[PDB]
Structures are given as structure tokens and as C-alpha cells.
Ligand binder design. Structure first.
Ligand SMILES: *[C@H](CNCCOc1ccc(/C(=C(/CC)c2ccccc2)c2ccc3[nH]ncc3c2)cc1)CC(=O)N(C)C
Ligand SMILES: *[C@H](CNCCOc1ccc(/C(=C(/CC)c2ccccc2)c2ccc3[nH]ncc3c2)cc1)CC(=O)N(C)C
Lengths: 246, 246
């Protein structure tokens, strides 16, 4: 089970889970002014979401949950997960956001859609903070897994027995990931004092990621989607997989 | 200075900083249906804000900052601070929110203003989580100070030298408060493993508090205030005090 993993096994499993880096799909022989920025981002987000499900399935402990709870966690966290990936990808590109290898964007190109230069600035600032902390790949994957498990864990509908057991499992997995982060820092030579301080610094950045996600969602809710099937239904279909292709 | 405090001195100073518990002002001989709930909450928030400034001034390290930065921190955090106080006050009142000693409200009384039963539910859930963790007063005050210093620290305008020095001081204070939290847990007998786990659990709840604040602000921005003087100007006046009354 998830709960019996060692730290090294946890880090291995998260590293092995990582999604691919996708490309934005645009005709590179076309004038950039012809492209809808929000169209490009929307299309990339949609493609990434499929791969996010696959990742989430390989995060230790996630598939032990109910499909309803898997959906709730992802519905809560999907923008935060996208954002932390972006910030990670952008760390070695000061002043820009690497949305994809062919879509590296600066502040000014943020000014296309209204509201978004604000968000862009907040993401660049986060990438800068990670650069300054020298965030490691191994710490990044722990943090992105924390988002997935933590973001929606306070907003379950119920205190039924099953819901109680699900929450308890989530918290125990999160406790394992904290242990792993501390293990990594201890292994890198940090003092115990430095370990707890860094743990706090990293977890407090997750509050800023939540903030950024909320402000993004505030824009996305503001202008009607594609008379969509609800995101929760789309998630259920991707997650509610059959075993026929085994 | 703030940076030279011991853990015990930090806990002392935060405990001594605590604001008063205020009452909602309504005529208790009037029918409850006559009261505007949003009016009652607005009026209480306004009165609490003055006392929040006084508190913030006594948080070690805060008055070492610029008035502009003091304003930015408070403008970022004021709802989160209100909310964490509320959740703390409500811990020993399952199913209800103790907004004030004479304004203890359940879910159903949340259904007055539209949008708000959702927020009420999220706050009750947080209070429940703190109850389950057996959050101590001493840990509560550390967490509320963390909100004040952390919430706006990623959204400063600049990378001027002065802004760089302010951020560096904030981070060093936050590092002191982490040390203090760990000290408290060590002093309560927790293992080192349990210390880091609890630290993480407490800091991850702050992400939910941010979320709740954002969703509250989303309502408050949605319906025009009192053609107000901007909150930043009001804050500047309360904070930009003279020394004549010394
Ligand atoms: C209708 C339906 N919206 C579906 C999802 O659309 C999007 C998801 C994600 C994004 C991304 C960003 C950049 C931060 C964004 C920009 C403005 C507002 C909110 C979010 C995005 C895309 C890909 C990424 N990969 N790593 C990180 C990211 C981030 C954009 C759109 C919503 C509607 O009514 N609208 C008017 C859009
Ligand atoms: C116009 C101006 N608004 C000024 C501030 O108004 C308020 C601040 C805080 C609150 C509080 C809550 C309860 C969670 C609330 C409810 C709904 C939406 C957002 C916030 C509140 C008050 C006192 C407290 N003490 N401890 C915790 C809290 C929380 C309410 C109003 C805004 C406007 O246009 N409007 C339509 C309101």
C-alpha cells in the first residue's frame, strides 16, 4: 500500500508518475496576432487534463479512494496543478512563462486577455521564489502531490463513515509526503532547523498557488464555456475507466 | 529586534498582542428578521479592523516594515485574519459560527444572503478540523501571524533594493515563527516526526483559509461598497499614526 512506502520509494513513484511536456498546437508559419491567446491556453489545458488524470492515478494512495472523491480532488485542484507545473517549467526562464516549449510568454504578451497580466505577474513571482529557493525536482513532485490531496480535502460533503475513512487515508498519505520532504532535506545536509524552515516555506507557497488558481477561476467562470458537460462529469469518464485494454 | 527573540519571547509577545472579543451591535429586544445579516457582519468587520491594526503593530517585526508594505500585508490578509479568529472562536461550538458572543449562527441562518451558506460550510469544516487537531491557543497565534506576514509577501510591486530587504526581513520573521511552532510541539512531547507532520497539517489549513477569503472577497466585490475611500487609504490612516498621544 501507499502507507507502507519508504521515502525513497515515494520519491521514485512520484518521479515515475510525471506527465509529458506537451506542445501548444498552432501553425508556426502564421502571424502571432492571428492566434487567440485564450484559445491557445484553453486547448493546452484540455490536453494536459487527460495526462493529469493518468498522473493522479499513479500518485500513491489516490486510486484507493472512491471515484467520487477522486473527482472531487481533481475538480478542486486541476488549476493549481497546472500552475505549479508551469511555475516549475519556468524557473530557468526569468521574466517568462514556459507554457509549452513553443509558447514562452513574457508579461507584455500577458496583456492580450483582460485580467491576465495580473495572473501572469503572480506566476512569474512564484517562479522567481522557487528559483531563489533552489527548488529541487524531488521536492517539486512532493508539492504537486500535496496539492492534489489537500486542495479539496476540507470540502467533502459528508461525515458518513466512508467519508471519514477517506479523509483519514488522505491525511495519512499527506503525512507520508511530509516525511519524504523532510527526508530529502535531511539527505541534502540541511540542519533540522533548516529542514522545518524550508518545509514551511514550501508549504506557504502553496497558499499563493491557491490564490492564483482562485483568481484564474474567477476569470474562467466569468464568460461561459462551450455549454460544457460539467467538469465533474468529464472527470468521472476519464477516471471511471474500464479494464478492457489490460 | 524581532530577529533576536527566543521562542518563549515570541509566544509571549503574540499572546499579549491578541485583540479583544467584540460584540455585534443590535437591539436584542428586536425581531431577528428585522436585522440585515450582511449589515451585522459588515459592521462587526469594520470594528474589528481597527483592533486588527493594533494587533498587527504588536506582531514582532511588522512595524520594522514600511507603511506602504504594512498596508499591502493587511490589505491582502484582513479577511483571512478575520476568518481564522472566527474559526478559533467557534471550535467549541459544533455546527455553529461564533461571530461574536451574541451572534452565534448555524448553517441555516447562513441561507439569508445568497452565496454565503457555502462559505459558512467551509468555515464550520475548518473549525471542526481544528477541533480534531486539538489546536492550542499558542499555535493559533503563530498561525494568525503567519497569515499576516505571508499572505501578501509574493505580490509586492518591486525588486528595488528596499523591497528586497523588506521581503528578506518578512521571511526571516516567518522562519522565527516556524521555529516557535516547532518549539511548542517539542515542548508538548511530540516526536520529531509528529512535529513536522503537525507543522505541515497546520500550514496546509492556511491554504483553505486563503480559499475561503477569496470566495468571500468574490461576493464583496460583486455588489458595490459605500462609495468608499479605498481600503488601502483607510489602512494608511489607521497605520500612519502620529506620536502626539504618547
Ligand atoms: C470556459 C472553459 N475553460 C476551460 C479551461 O480553460 C483554461 C484553463 C487554463 C488556462 C490557463 C491560464 C493561464 C494561467 C489561465 C488564464 C486566464 C484565466 C485562467 C487561467 C492555463 C492553460 C494551460 C496551462 N498549462 N500550465 C498552466 C496552464 C494554465 C486557460 C484557460 C471558461 C471561460 O468562460 N473563459 C472565458 C476562458
Ligand atoms: C462592500 C464593503 N464590504 C466591507 C467589508 O464587509 C464585510 C467584511 C467581512 C464579512 C464577514 C463575512 C462572514 C464570513 C462575509 C460574508 C459574506 C461575504 C464575505 C464575507 C465577516 C465579518 C466579521 C467577521 N468576524 N470574524 C469573521 C468575520 C467575517 C462581511 C462583510 C462589499 C459589498 O459590496 N457587499 C455586497 C457586502
Amino acid at each position: 500500500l501507499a502507507l507502507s512506502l519508504t521515502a525513497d520509494q515515494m520519491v521514485s513513484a512520484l518521479l515515475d508518475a510525471e506527465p509529458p511536456i506537451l506542445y501548444s498546437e498552432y501553425d508556426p508559419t502564421r502571424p502571432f496576432s492571428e492566434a487567440s491567446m485564450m484559445g491557445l491556453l484553453t486547448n493546452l489545458a484540455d490536453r494536459e487534463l487527460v495526462h493529469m488524470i493518468n498522473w493522479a492515478k499513479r500518485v500513491p494512495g489516490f486510486v484507493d479512494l472512491t471515484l467520487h472523491d477522486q473527482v472531487h480532488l481533481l475538480e478542486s485542484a486541476w488549476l493549481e496543478i497546472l500552475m505549479i507545473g508551469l511555475v516549475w517549467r519556468s524557473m530557468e526562464h526569468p521574466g517568462k512563462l514556459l507554457f509549452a516549449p513553443n509558447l514562452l510568454l513574457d508579461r507584455n504578451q500577458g496583456k492580450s486577455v483582460e485580467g491576465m497580466v495580473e495572473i501572469f505577474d503572480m506566476l512569474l513571482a512564484t517562479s522567481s521564489r522557487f528559483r531563489m529557493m533552489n527548488l529541487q525536482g524531488e521536492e517539486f513532485v512532493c508539492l504537486k502531490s500535496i496539492i492534489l490531496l489537500n486542495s479539496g480535502v476540507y470540502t467533502f460533503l459528508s461525515s458518513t463513515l466512508k467519508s471519514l475513512e477517506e479523509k483519514d487515508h488522505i491525511h495519512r498519505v499527506l503525512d507520508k509526503i511530509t516525511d519524504t520532504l523532510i527526508h530529502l532535506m535531511a539527505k541534502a545536509g540541511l540542519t533540522l532547523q533548516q529542514q522545518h524552515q524550508r518545509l514551511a516555506q514550501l508549504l506557504l507557497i502553496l497558499s499563493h498557488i491557491r490564490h492564483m488558481s482562485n483568481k484564474g477561476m474567477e476569470h474562467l467562470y466569468s464568460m461561459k464555456c462551450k455549454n460544457v458537460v460539467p467538469l465533474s462529469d468529464l472527470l468521472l469518464e476519464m477516471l471511471d475507466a474500464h479494464r478492457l485494454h489490460a
